[PDB]
Amino acid sequence: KGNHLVKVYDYQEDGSVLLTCDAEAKNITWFKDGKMIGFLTEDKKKWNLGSNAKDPRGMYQCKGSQNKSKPLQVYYRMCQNCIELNAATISGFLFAEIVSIFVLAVGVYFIAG
């Protein structure tokens, strides 16, 4: 281990990310972004974050009965806003802009009063 308690649960198909730090004691305090963020009780040991599609980030920390531990700064890039502009997307956007602008301009032209 070498004084690195915080880990991340792996081997999961559910769209959620969790944490895990091992401290054989009671009242194993938790942390997030250095500042105090919570606590821990019996019957559960894993702090939860939610879906990975929201891209969790920031430094995370845990502490048992020992001194200040070291973080597990997590980075995710589940994009989910992923426009691919290679050969058939920039052209489509350009055409949809041009023809819409033209059809708007014709209508504005045909207003004389």
Add this chain to the structure above:
Amino acid sequence: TEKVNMMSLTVLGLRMLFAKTVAVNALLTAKLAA
């Protein structure tokens, strides 16, 4: 996969909205010309 099918519904809603609004604009422009 529960979010891929959500954007595939928002796109349907937006296309529906655009089809309604183009008719709105066409009708109001036809009125304005008269």
Add this chain to the structure above:
Amino acid sequence: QTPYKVSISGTTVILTCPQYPGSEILWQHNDKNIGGDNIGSDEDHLSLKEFSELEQSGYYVCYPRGSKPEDANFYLYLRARVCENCMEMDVMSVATIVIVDICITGGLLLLVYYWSKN
């Protein structure tokens, strides 16, 4: 202190170790030495070519040469899914394209409206 910085552009994953700039530093990926034969190999700069979601993803720790790594500051976890030339639209990009769109629509309609009266 200093977090770990990563920047990705398409299939080119770039990350560096903003911890010890003037030093000599090595690498692992899931407790396996990585670097030197692709894969970028600089004292702090590094490139992941041909990044994959399910085969290059794990604990990126960055130790100086001659120092066993369990005494380092902290680790990184990275589960990036890459594209083939796709763009990540944050809240700024959508806003700027919307603003330029409405500006170019207004400035083009008000031109023909002035032309309608001729």
Add this chain to the structure above:
Amino acid sequence: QTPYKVSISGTTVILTCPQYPGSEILWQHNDKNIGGDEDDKNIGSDEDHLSLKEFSELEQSGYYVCYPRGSKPEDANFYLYLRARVCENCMEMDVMSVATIVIVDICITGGLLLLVYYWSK
């Protein structure tokens, strides 16, 4: 004979078994008592219903079994295997469950349009 029912709404999941309608029923999940502990708000029983809050795919998804007092753990001959991958406020709809609503909206829009068109005449 005696059936089983299970309803999943969003994240919370509720189970019920009518095997013993005349007696309130204790439960198990891979040989451990889960019915009645006056704590762990994530779970909790009722006269018949048992609710499992924050359901997880990889845990508490096993051989549920409902048994009353005076019943051995192996005395019950009816079991269940459940595997549910649930999320927060998510339901099921296919193409024909959205086609109907889109057609209904189009039809009601056309009906209002014709009602307001004939009204001007």
Add this chain to the structure above:
Amino acid sequence: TLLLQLTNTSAYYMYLLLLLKSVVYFAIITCCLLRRT
């Protein structure tokens, strides 16, 4: 499939832009109509 997500999120923003164009056009024409009447 990833390709479906890419195409879908490509079309969503384009249709949002078209909707914004339609809204601004409606604003212009309704201003003209109010000026006329």
Add this chain to the structure above:
Amino acid sequence: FKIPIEELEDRVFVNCNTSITWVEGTVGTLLSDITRLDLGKRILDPRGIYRCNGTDIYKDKESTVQVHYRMCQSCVELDPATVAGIIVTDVIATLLLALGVFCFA
């Protein structure tokens, strides 16, 4: 008896030491080999009340195991932020269209 619901990479299996009898629900695809059953893919959500006989240590007794699956992939994660705005703006759009029709006449 606990009937092992064996899981392949993407297929589920029902394993009992004696032929499996289907009573209510989905009969699935019966393997030609005796004492095995392929309900279907893990994503088609099989279900149904089944029945088998005693195992290698516990003969001459019979019980049942209901099987349920909700590994949904046709699911939609909708939020009340966008799905409500869509309805509200559709209502305002059809109101605008109805107002526009009156102007036409």
Add this chain to the structure above:
Amino acid sequence: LLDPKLCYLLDGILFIYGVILTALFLRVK
């Protein structure tokens, strides 16, 4: 899992409108 089918849904609806308006035009041309 749902997108390709919803394509033909809206594509067909507008096609119906186009054909109907074409018939209306051809009855008055």
Add this chain to the structure above:
Amino acid sequence: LDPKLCYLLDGILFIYGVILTALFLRVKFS
């Protein structure tokens, strides 16, 4: 083989609808 054929077909259909509407509203005015 149809990721974008959807919207490609839809784009042409909208254009034809708008064009045919433009001619129709003309005749209605007479």
